[PDB]
Design a binder for this molecule. Structure first.
Ligand SMILES: CCCCCCCCCCCCCCCCCC(=O)OC[C@H](COP(=O)([O-])OCC[N+](C)(C)C)OC(=O)CCCCCCCCCCCCCCCCC
Ligand SMILES: CCCCCCCCCCCCCCCCCC(=O)OC[C@H](COP(=O)(O)OCCN)OC(=O)CCCCCCCCCCCCCCCCC
Ligand SMILES: CCCCCCCCCCCCCCCCCC(=O)O[C@@H](COC(=O)CCCCCCCCCCCCCCC)COP(=O)(O)OC[C@H](O)CO
Ligand SMILES: CCCCCCCCCCC[C@H](O)CC(=O)SCCNC(=O)CCNC(=O)[C@H](O)C(C)(C)COP(=O)(O)O
Ligand SMILES: CCCCCCCCCCCCCC(=O)O
Lengths: 172, 173, 459, 220, 122, 128, 166, 86, 20, 12, 64, 43, 156
């Protein structure tokens, strides 16, 4: 929603240091330059003129957009990294496992029995968790994509199935 | 041998006698030796068994021969009865001539590996024979069209000495 | 000859008089049996065509297409018994009646010895296909689609009717042998061009060349699965058969008048394949790919070169078997998702692993990857075209380069990638769909060992 | 090239898998003692690539550089081969410097391991192959190219001068990173590092035009 | 060597172009010059499967090298003297090459200064 | 201050250098407040049918079918012949076709010229 | 007619066996990678004998096996040409990929589709020594795309990685 | 890679905050909210999460990085992101 | 990753080696 | 440890 | 043993059928397996016809 | 600190890496020349 | 299901049906800009910013993460140019005009003096390959009947 100034500065601080890390590479340089980079940040902390603070962040990222490393450092799991959705091709949705032939299902009896409990739980919980939704939905549709928790006891938080039953990040 | 040596002239192979001097054993002799009593002999043993069985009950087959039949230059105009024999005879000779080029092409390709680095000059005879065939083949069937017929082949040919005799008249002057 | 025809038409009473639920079985039995008998016809002699009577004859060109059509006949029955299960027995019987009646006409026209006899069932194939597209088609714009497909071919076929009867009144009979033996040099008189145009445009229309092709995307997409295969795997190819047969009395007029079509076809294939690169509909993308391959044959046939005819017959069959398979791929995916947009169901390989394979050789075959019969077709045509002119390879090779991008484009968008979260009705593939898919690919590689069977009379 | 170039990959693959599938050259350092065999494997491979005498690359590259020099060729073409050979050593130092000769930079939990016989046997199998390599092939094949004999010694050393020269400054440039001075972004670095600017343009301009032509024009 | 600079940086008329020489007649400047007497006739050089670029005068010191290699097998450390003999022969062939190069080179500058000497006197 | 980054249709200006949101107004911030609301209005019911146990099918996107319609059928009914459309059609139509005709015509008009006077070599060219 | 020509060709028929065995699906679904690695090893060991025969004698082969099909004056035939450029390349190429196979099991010790992976490498391999060993331009063109399409699948081994497909 | 389990996470987690000289070891609690009691400025909070990022090797999105606020909550967000349940 | 590996990992320390 | 792996039914 | 039956059913058997195919089918057709002429050197005799072709004529005595 | 402490400290210099094994390599050298010089002398 | 009126229609001339069309694409009127009426039949489909899917924030949760798309939002008319696999639009660190300038500069710079490199080739001062038997005429495909012109090499 509102990308207020302080988050933008934190965006500037976090990403610039990562780029600065990609430059210095050596830890002592990275540590040394970070502190001075830190030092020149907090020194201008007293500005009642928020517009001036914005003006101070005009040339800020422009120098960054010049000073940006053409190949920044990203851990491979993150977007752009080498191991980005590398193991996605393995993860398969759980609902496809309902298709399994009974002989295949018989190969894993107790786990399939546990699935039945989850199937049973999600059934009545759906009506309960959906009922909580309309009774507390803000007027004029949802104003924020954040989803309210389960207010009462026993009931599960609404729309919990896909998040909870999401395939693990390392499926094999 | 199954095929004919005249159709496929094979110059005699020049195999040098093995005269090594180094005392350490030449390995390739041994690998050939073990191969002989591990692969070659069992293959030959099976081969002599199959070949004698083949000769036990021998059945024959011959090669069909088409006698000469009047072609299209003496076939009457229209008269598709005589055109049928004419066209089929010409197309049969087309097949033979295509195979004739094929035979020459193999002989030319046979020289390449056979002569090795001597290919450039050793079989210039093979080169000119193919050159003579290919040029003459061009005058016979080339550019006849996908719907080629003995009529067109005669038509294309009839242009040839038409231009040639016209050139001969000019040459005589 | 007869040993194929009566078994085909006598198959019709069987389906009508069979039991309520056995219709698919007994029809499939003898359709495959008919295929076996047709394969017995595949043999050819050296130069004289296999002639049977005044009414029917076969050559090295007709025979490969004949066995292809009979081979096709089981496949529509296999491909259709999923969206017609919930239908009254009479309509199912009527649907089967349409296919074999259609297939019966195909045997007739390919074996026809007289051009008019070739002509009469040349359009007669339209009536069963018009019913298939209109009645059992599953869409809304199928009505306009059937009209476009019907009128386009008639608009081209009727000039052939006037042209063909003119031959009869001028050169006696129109028996294919009698035309070939009594061929005369067509003059350059300004009437002979309209003579030439009429004898060619009829086969142009149902062989979609750039400009005269807008019916095909509307023909294929709204047609049902069985209609799409028959239309793309044989119907686009009656035009092909006609040109190899009818260009006997169009020379040397074909030498000079070929230019507008050759430029239209060679440029069209680049344009059409470009459309494939950005098609939103999977069935439409396959349909436009057929235009590109078919337009390649237009250059092939119209060059009139021994090599060009040979590569034509190679692409003649290989494209038909491949296009039928790709339409099966789209159909086998369609009902699961109940939509035609390509990006609707991405990452299908993680869900259906075998269909990932079946889509894979299917895309490779359409790629003209050697030694698949498609490569023998395209590569032979390129050499014939290159001899005709050196420049065309720039156009020729560019098509292969474009053909690569869009072919794997459907592969990556559908098979590879992340599976769609929302969809949950994708069930494990029925072994009918799997069996049918191998029914297509397996003879294709089986044909690779013996190109000489499908090279044609020029071979 | 089949021997030593194939090496550098699973040698690199050894560090990748062992150091938790990380492929950024800026995260290793100090691996010399951590993976002695992998480090040993890489230095032989890099030296083979540079063309150290009497081992693999010498039997081909040192002959090639001498060969093209000893011929009627394009003068501009010959010059780039020398610069490339010096640059060939240049990135070789960069790999050995950043990856091995330094201090650890990977995440704290270390899992460095190469003791698996599969990795050891595979690498060693090509190691004995790469050590001798050209000696066997050159001595075995019949003498079937024309050998040039009278080189003016000044250019016969060029096969070794340029790489040794390129070794020098690349090392000096690499440990200049150890120097505390900040590295200002040079415009040449902005060019060389971005794959030489080719992917940014040729993979965005021609693809967009042809695609836009297909939809906007053509089809529509 | 340095003749590249002498040709391009300096005048080009005083460097014998590699695509041109020899230009002056071999007898001109060489009274009673002898011919390169070849040794292995075209026959023996042929069936040795000798490649065309190696079919030179020093090829005689290449053919027996193959013979030494044939009996050397499996040992590949033999033929050292023969190979060195072959390389030394190509050295003798090679040392002649720039001898001819400067023969033309020295002659053409000599022709230049002779021309000026026999032109400025008028 | 090193020279700025000028954008392009293929390399757009990044949001980090975009002057609009750095100079927000007491109105533009209000504009980017119902953006999330309608986004939630699209996300909420989507998850509802996505997480519905009884739901066995495909959640058709009205935006998706709109895109296919606008790109497949809703072209000619919205098409109007104008000089821009007319010239582009002619330029991309007859243009390339006639261009290739001239190229192929002159090439063939040189090829047959050479062979007619015997100025070309096909000594080994037989399988045409 | 030495074993040279005979056993230089079987080397090709040696390493196509793992492909056929995989299609049976009776093939060992666990120790498959070991099966191919050992197979390539034997293919390598066989490959030296044509090599060792070469530098001794210096004979390079052209074998014209089963005649595919004849085109009038063209006789397109499956033919393998064992030049020095070939008879040397098979020994080194299998030697490298055999070592790669040994490294492959350790590195890809967790990929669930590992049997498919080793099958692809062999399929790539076959496409290779039919490219180098190509007496006719057509079967040279066979490899020139057989390897290319094989690279596409191998490069996109992680099908889900959108960049890998790109 | 052995299964990284939440007990190991918090051990590695509090290892780094104790390492941070601005947070001397004595008063580290599992749920010690940074600026509420430790006085750690939020500008350094956008700095301790990259220390976590290299500690466990993965990127923390900013949407929750500003929300990553307590050492127990540090551990909590770590576990589910790598499906750590044990 | 079962217990009993001969290359048991370490935290912020030099990893153990083997004479082999 | 050992935990269930999900996979589409390959029985058919 | 695992190497034995692997040798027989993957090396020994395939080379058997290849040799049979080569010796009696491929070589039964002309110009299918075309060798190179075994290079012969001055002074090297051949076994087919016995005679030794002449030695090289004495070199002009080049020594280093 | 851990990256600069423990066994991770005092890493070898650049040129120190390339000449790894020289001490043993030279050790194998001297015996090698001794063997061949004696063998040549016996000839 | 979508019956008829969420299907796209003709260009909205006046703001009333512009508002209706904006609701038809579940977006407000302040951000609903139709394509220009060039006559190319784009209809009432909205101008969406020419930005590839690569510019979408990956950390945001999308209903179609591979294309980074939610459900129901109006997707670009040209989605199959700007898909992640296909043409990108992400801002390069250096300007596009400079992007082309240096690249076009390099290729031309390298190509040009390659021609001048051909103008002044590099060669050692060495004569030609003295070849025996009149420059190997007979063994280079020369006609045996056509006698070669006498080519001999001397000693210097
Ligand atoms: C001696 C004999 C040895 C055993 C031979 C066994 C067969 C074999 O491999 O032959 C190799 C031979 C090789 O020929 P050859 O010239 O090598 O000679 C054979 C004998 N040897 C090998 C010893 C030299 O090739 C063929 O026989 C060609 C086989 C082609 C198969 C085509 C199958 C088509 C199936 C179509 C099904 C669908 C129909 C409907 C659709 C049609 C299309 C539209
Ligand atoms: C001399 C040089 C001549 C030209 C050589 C080729 C130029 C580039 C051609 C396309 C290259 C592959 C490609 O499609 O690249 C674009 C893109 C991948 O871009 P990339 O920078 O790799 O980023 C990937 C994500 N990080 O990948 C994609 O967008 C893939 C999906 C779309 C692919 C469309 C490809 C269309 C190509 C048409 C080319 C027509 C003109 C050819 C001219 C030269 C002919 C020889
Ligand atoms: C949708 C429009 C059609 C699509 C494209 C179809 C092909 C284009 C050309 C169509 C030609 C149709 C008529 C051709 C019939 C056979 C022609 C033939 O055999 O050749 C004759 C060609 O003669 C003709 O005049 C044929 C017709 C020429 C074209 C004029 C009429 C056809 C075009 C208009 C009607 C069709 C178009 C659609 C109208 C709604 C030879 O006779 P001749 O003139 O040489 O006779 C001897 C002497 O000279 C006097 O007769
Ligand atoms: C290598 C280097 C490359 C180049 C790298 C960038 C270097 C140049 C830019 C440096 C920053 C610039 O001068 C000014 C600016 O953007 S902002 C100044 C601080 N004032 C504010 O931001 C508003 C009030 N203050 C707060 O909002 C909080 O105090 C804060 C979030 C900042 C701290 O966290 P807490 O406390 O909430
Ligand atoms: C000390 C000199 C180092 C560089 C030597 C090689 C320079 C380029 C080659 C110049 C001579 C060969 C080309 C001409 O002739």
């Amino acid at each position: 929603a509102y990308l207020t100034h302080q988050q933008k500065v934190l965006r500037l601080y976090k990403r610039a240091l990562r780029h600065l890390e990609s430059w210095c590479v050596h830890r002592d340089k990275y540590r040394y330059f970070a502190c001075l980079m830190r030092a020149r940040f907090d020194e201008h902390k007293n500005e009642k003129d928020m517009v001036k603070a914005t003006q101070l962040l005009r040339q800020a990222e422009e120098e960054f957009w010049y000073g940006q490393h053409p190949q920044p450092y990203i851990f491979p799991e993150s977007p752009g990294g080498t191991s980005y959705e590398r193991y996605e091709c393995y993860k398969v949705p759980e609902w496809c496992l309902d298709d399994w032939h009974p002989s295949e299902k018989a190969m894993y009896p107790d786990y399939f029995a546990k699935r039945e409990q989850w199937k049973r739980l999600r059934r009545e919980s759906w009506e309960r968790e959906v009922k909580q939704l309309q009774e507390e939905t803000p007027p004029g549709g949802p104003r924020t994509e954040a989803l309210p928790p389960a207010r009462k006891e026993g009931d599960l938080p609404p729309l919990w199935w896909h998040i909870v039953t999401r395939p693990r990040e390392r499926p094999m | 041998d199954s095929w004919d040596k005249d159709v496929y002239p094979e110059p005699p192979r020049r195999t040098p006698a093995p005269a090594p001097q180094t005392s350490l054993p030449n390995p390739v002799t041994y690998l050939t030796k073990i191969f002989d009593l591990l692969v070659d002999r069992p293959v030959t043993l099976a081969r002599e068994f199959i070949e004698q069985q083949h000769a036990k009950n021998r059945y024959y087959y011959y090669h069909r021969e088409f006698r000469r039949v009047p072609d299209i230059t003496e076939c009457e105009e229209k008269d598709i009865l005589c055109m049928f024999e004419a066209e089929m005879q010409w197309r049969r000779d087309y097949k033979v001539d295509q195979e004739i080029v094929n035979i020459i092409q193999e002989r030319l390709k046979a020289c390449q590996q056979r002569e090795g680095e001597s290919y450039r000059q050793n079989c210039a005879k093979e080169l000119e024979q193919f050159t003579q065939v290919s040029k003459a083949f061009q005058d016979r069937y080339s550019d006849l069209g996908a719907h080629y017929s003995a009529r067109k082949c005669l038509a294309k040919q009839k242009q040839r000495m038409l231009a040639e005799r016209k050139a001969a008249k000019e040459a005589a002057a | 000859m007869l040993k194929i025809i009566i078994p085909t038409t006598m198959l019709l009473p069987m389906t009508w008089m069979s039991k309520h639920n056995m219709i698919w079985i007994n029809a499939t039995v003898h359709s495959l049996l008919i295929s076996l008998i047709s394969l017995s016809l595949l043999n050819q002699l050296g130069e004289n065509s296999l002639n049977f009577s005044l009414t029917f004859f076969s050559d090295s060109l007709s025979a490969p297409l004949l066995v292809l059509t009979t081979w096709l006949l089981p496949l529509m029955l296999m491909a259709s018994q999923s969206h017609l299960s919930k239908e009254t027995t009479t309509r199912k019987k009527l649907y089967i009646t349409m296919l074999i009646l259609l297939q019966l006409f195909l045997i007739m026209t390919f074996t026809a010895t007289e051009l008019i006899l070739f002509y009469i069932l040349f359009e007669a194939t339209l009536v069963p296909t018009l019913i298939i597209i209109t009645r059992w088609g599953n869409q809304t714009e199928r009505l306009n689609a059937g009209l476009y497909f019907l009128f386009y071919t008639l608009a081209g076929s009727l000039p052939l009717l006037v042209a063909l009867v003119y031959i009869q009144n001028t050169t006696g009979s129109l028996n294919f042998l009698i035309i070939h033996y009594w061929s005369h040099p067509l003059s350059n008189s300004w009437s002979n061009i309209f003579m030439w145009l009429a004898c060619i445009m009829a086969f142009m229309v149902k062989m979609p060349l750039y400009g005269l092709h807008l019916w095909l995307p509307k023909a294929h997409v709204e047609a049902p699965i069985a209609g799409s295969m028959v239309l793309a795997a044989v119907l686009l190819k009656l035009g092909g058969y006609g040109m190899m047969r009818i260009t006997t009395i169009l020379n040397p007029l074909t030498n000079y008048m070929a230019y507008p079509f050759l430029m239209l076809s060679m440029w069209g294939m680049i344009m059409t394949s470009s459309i494939c690169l950005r098609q939103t509909d999977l069935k439409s993308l396959i349909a436009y790919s057929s235009v590109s391959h078919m337009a390649l044959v237009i250059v092939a046939i119209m060059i009139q070169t021994p090599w060009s005819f040979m590569g034509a017959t190679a692409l003649m069959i290989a494209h038909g078997l491949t296009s039928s398979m790709l339409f099966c791929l789209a159909n086998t995916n369609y009902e699961r998702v109940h939509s035609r947009t390509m990006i609707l169901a991405r990452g299908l390989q993680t869900l259906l692993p075998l269909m990932a394979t079946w889509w894979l050789m299917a895309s490779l075959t359409n790629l003209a990857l050697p030694p698949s019969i498609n490569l023998i077709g395209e590569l032979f045509i390129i050499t014939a075209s290159f001899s005709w002119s050196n420049i065309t390879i720039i156009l020729m090779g560019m098509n292969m380069m474009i053909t690569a991008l869009y072919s794997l484009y459907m592969l990556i968008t559908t098979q590879r990638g992340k599976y769609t979260h929302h969809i949950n009705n994708i069930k494990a593939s029925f072994t009918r769909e799997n069996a049918l898919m191998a029914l297509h690919i397996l003879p294709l590689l089986l044909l690779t060992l013996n190109p000489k069977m499908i090279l044609g009379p020029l071979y | 090239h089949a021997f030593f170039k194939a090496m550098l990959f699973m040698c690199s693959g050894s560090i990748i898998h062992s150091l938790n599938d990380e492929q950024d050259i800026r995260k290793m350092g100090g691996l010399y003692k951590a993976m002695p065999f992998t480090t040993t494997a890489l230095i032989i491979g890099s030296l083979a690539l540079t063309g150290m005498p009497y081992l693999t690359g010498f039997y081909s590259k040192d002959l090639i550089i001498e060969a093209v020099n000893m011929s009627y060729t394009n003068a501009w073409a010959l010059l780039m081969t020398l610069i490339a050979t010096s640059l060939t050593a240049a990135y070789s130092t960069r790999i050995i410097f950043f990856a091995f000769l330094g201090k650890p930079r990977f995440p704290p939990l270390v899992l460095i391991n190469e003791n698996n016989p599969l990795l050891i046997n595979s690498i060693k199998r090509l190691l004995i192959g790469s050590i001798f390599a050209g000696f066997i092939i050159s001595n075995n094949i019949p003498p079937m190219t024309v050998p040039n004999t009278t080189m003016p010694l000044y250019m016969k050393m060029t096969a070794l001068i340029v790489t040794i020269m390129g070794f020098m400054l690349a090392l000096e440039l690499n440990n200049t990173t150890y120097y505390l001075k900040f590295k200002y972004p040079s415009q040449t670095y902005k060019f060389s590092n971005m794959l030489g600017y080719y992917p940014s343009i040729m993979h965005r301009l021609p693809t967009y035009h042809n695609l836009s032509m297909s939809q906007k024009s053509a089809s529509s | 060597g340095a003749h590249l600079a002498r040709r391009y940086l300096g005048d080009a008329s005083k460097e014998p172009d590699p695509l041109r020489m020899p230009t002056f007649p071999p007898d001109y400047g060489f009274p009673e010059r002898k011919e390169r007497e070849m040794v292995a006739t075209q026959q023996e050089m042929n069936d040795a499967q000798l490649m065309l670029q190696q079919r030179d005068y020093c090829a005689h010191y290449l053919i027996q090298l193959l013979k030494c290699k044939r009996d050397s097998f499996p040992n590949f450390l033999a033929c050292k003297h023969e190979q060195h003999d072959w390389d030394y022969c190509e050295h003798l062939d090679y040392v002649k090459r720039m001898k001819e190069f400067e023969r033309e080179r020295r002659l053409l500058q000599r022709k230049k200064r002779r021309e000026q000497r026999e032109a400025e006197m008028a | 201050s090193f020279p700025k980054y000028k954008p392009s249709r293929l390399a757009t200006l990044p949001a980090t250098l975009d002057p609009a949101e750095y100079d927000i107004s007491p109105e533009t911030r209000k504009a980017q407040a119902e953006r999330l609301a309608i986004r939630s209005r699209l996300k909420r019911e989507y998850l509802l049918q996505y997480n519905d146990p009884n739901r066995l099918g495909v959640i058709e996107d009205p935006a998706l079918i709109r895109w296919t319609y606008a790109r497949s059928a809703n072209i000619y009914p919205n098409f109007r012949p104008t000089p821009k459309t007319s010239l582009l059609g002619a330029l991309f139509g007859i243009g390339p076709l006639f261009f290739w005709y001239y190229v192929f015509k002159t090439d063939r008009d040189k090829k047959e010229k050479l062979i007619q006077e015997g100025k070309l070599d096909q000594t080994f060219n037989i399988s045409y | 007619m030495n074993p040279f020509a005979s056993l230089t060709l079987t080397t090709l028929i040696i390493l196509t066996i793992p492909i056929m065995m995989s299609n049976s699906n009776i093939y060992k679904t666990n120790l498959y990678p070991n099966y191919v690695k050992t197979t390539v090893s034997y293919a390598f060991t066989l490959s030296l004998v044509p090599l060792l025969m070469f530098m001794h004698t210096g004979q390079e082969m052209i074998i014209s096996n089963w005649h595919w099909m004849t085109l009038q004056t063209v006789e397109l035939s499956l033919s393998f040409k064992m030049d020095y450029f070939s008879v040397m390349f098979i020994p080194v190429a299998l030697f490298v990929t055999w070592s790669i196979m040994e490294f492959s099991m350790w590195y890809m010790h967790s990929d669930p589709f590992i049997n498919r992976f080793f099958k692809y490498l062999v399929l790539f391999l076959i496409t290779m020594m039919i490219l180098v060993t190509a007496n006719n331009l057509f079967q040279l063109f066979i490899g020139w795309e057989g390897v290319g399409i094989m690279s596409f699948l191998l490069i996109g081994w992680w099908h889900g990685r959108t960049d890998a497909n790109t | 890679a052995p299964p990284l389990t939440l007990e190991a996470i918090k051990d590695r987690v509090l290892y780094v905050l104790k390492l941070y000289d601005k947070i001397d070891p004595e008063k580290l609690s599992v749920n010690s909210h940074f600026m509420k009691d430790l006085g750690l400025d939020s500008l350094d909070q956008v700095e301790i999460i990259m220390a976590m990022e290299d500690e466990f090797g993965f990127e923390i999105p900013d949407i929750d990085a500003e929300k990553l606020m307590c050492p127990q909550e540090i551990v909590d967000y770590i576990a589910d992101k790598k499906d750590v349940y044990e | 990753a079962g217990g009993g590996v001969h290359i048991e990992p370490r935290y912020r320390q030099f990893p153990q080696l083997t004479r082999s | 440890k050992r935990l269930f792996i999900i996979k589409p039914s390959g029985f058919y | 043993y695992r190497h034995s039956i692997f040798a027989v059913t993957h090396v020994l058997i395939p080379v058997w059928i290849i040799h049979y195919y080569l010796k009696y089918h491929v070589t039964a057709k002309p110009y299918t397996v075309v060798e190179r002429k075994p290079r012969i050197f001055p002074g090297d005799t051949i076994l087919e016809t016995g005679e030794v072709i002449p030695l090289m004529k004495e070199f002009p005595d080049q020594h280093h | 600190a851990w990256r600069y402490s423990g066994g991770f400290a005092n890493n070898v210099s650049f040129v120190g890496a390339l000449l790894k094994g020289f001490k043993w390599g030279f050790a194998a050298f001297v015996v090698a020349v001794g063997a061949e010089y004696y063998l040549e002398s016996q000839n | 299901h979508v019956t008829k009126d969420m299907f796209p229609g003709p260009y909205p001339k006046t703001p009333e049906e512009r508002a209706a069309a904006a609701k038809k694409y579940n977006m407000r009127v302040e951000d609903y800009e139709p394509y220009p009426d060039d006559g190319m039949g784009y209809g009432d489909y909205p101008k969406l910013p020419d930005r590839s899917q690569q510019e979408r924030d990956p950390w945001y949760d999308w209903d179609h993460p591979d294309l980074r798309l939610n459900w129901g939002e109006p997707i670009h008319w040209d989605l199959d140019m700007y898909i992640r696999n296909r043409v990108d639009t992400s801002p390069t660190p250096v300007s596009w005009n400079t992007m082309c300038k240096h690249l076009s500069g390099f290729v031309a710079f390298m190509l040009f003096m390659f021609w001048v490199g051909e103008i002044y080739p590099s060669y050692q001062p060495v004569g030609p390959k003295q070849y025996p038997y009149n420059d190997l005429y007979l063994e280079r495909g020369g006609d045996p009947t056509k006698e070669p012109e006498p080519v001999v090499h001397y000693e210097i």
